[PDB]
Each structure stands twice: as structure tokens, then as C-alpha cells.
Symmetry: C2
Subunit: 96 residues, 2 copies
């Protein structure tokens, strides 16, 4: 089936979409333990704008609370815990 | 509202997911015309393997026909046309 033009723009457009981020990357301050999973999916702005002169930019954000598993690499002890992650809420193509 | 673990895992796992690819990166030879949209969303493998020494890799590929607008900067015409893109059918965590 050919994916119709409107269905194409619907997904290509600048907007918030599921984006994988590394826990250790988002929290560089976390440098003693392992996390499972090691990455989480959160909304981030992405999509192609009218031209490369513009970039899909976040104009709003918030903090999501996500449950993950903290694994102590030294004792192999792991336990559920809630960690905060930054998430984009609104997007717009901007000059940048 | 905390995001429950099982849900966090379901999304973070290595699997095929919506991925933005520019028409130029998927069709490097298409350098003369302008496309609307200039990028498309297609299924590609990504995710964080439980085993950190593993990388999320495609184990099957297929194609998708997508309708796009081609704008000719010389003739100034712009019409619809079907363009094919590669997608990942399935993935697996493999050392790499």
C-alpha cells in the first residue's frame, strides 16, 4: 500500500515524539550504579521544517516521573525507584 | 503520575520504531529537486539491550512506498510521486 501524502506529513512534521535517552546521559551525576533499562522513552521535539534554515524547537517542557531499576554493580542488588526526566511538551520550527 | 516499570521496559526495548530519515540520506542521488516533506518516518531498529555489550540490530528488512511531493526548482512544477524507503522488519540484540 502506498502511504498517502497526508499520512506522511502527519508523521514528518515538527512535533513531540517518543525519543530514547540514556539514563547515565540525562543524569551525569549518577556515576555509581547501573540502571535497568539503561534508557527510557520520553517525548522530545523532532521533525523536518520547511527548510534547513529552520529547526524543530521545544517551546515548552515538563518533568516526568519514571520508575526504573537501580542495580548496585558491587553487590548486584537491584531495586525499583522513581527517577525524574525532562520531557518536551510543545514544539515549533524556529530559525535557530 | 509515575510511569510504571513494565511500561518503561516495553518502550525502551530493542525493537523497530518510528525513525525520521531525510530523503537525501535515503536517496543521496536526489540532489536537484526539493521534496515536501523533506524527511519521512520509517520503522528502524533501536533500543537499549539489557546486555550493554549488545546493540539493537535489524534481522530483516522490507520496503515501504511513500507518497511525496517533488518540487522542480527549474521548471517550478511540483507533483506527487511514490518513493520507496527501507524499513526494518525485526531486531535482535547482538554483540557489536
Amino acid at each position: 500500500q502506498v502511504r498517502p501524502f497526508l499520512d506522511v506529513y502527519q508523521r514528518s512534521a515538527c512535533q513531540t515524539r517518543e525519543t530514547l535517552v540514556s539514563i547515565l546521559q540525562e543524569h551525569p551525576d549518577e556515576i555509581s550504579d547501573i540502571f535497568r533499562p539503561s534508557c527510557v522513552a520520553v517525548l522530545r521535539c523532532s521533525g523536518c521544517c520547511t527548510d534547513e534554515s529552520m529547526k524543530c524547537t521545544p517551546v515548552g517542557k515538563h518533568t516526568a516521573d519514571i520508575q526504573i531499576m537501580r542495580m548496585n554493580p558491587r553487590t548486584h542488588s537491584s531495586k525499583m525507584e522513581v527517577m525524574k526526566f525532562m520531557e518536551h511538551t510543545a514544539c515549533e520550527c524556529r530559525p535557530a
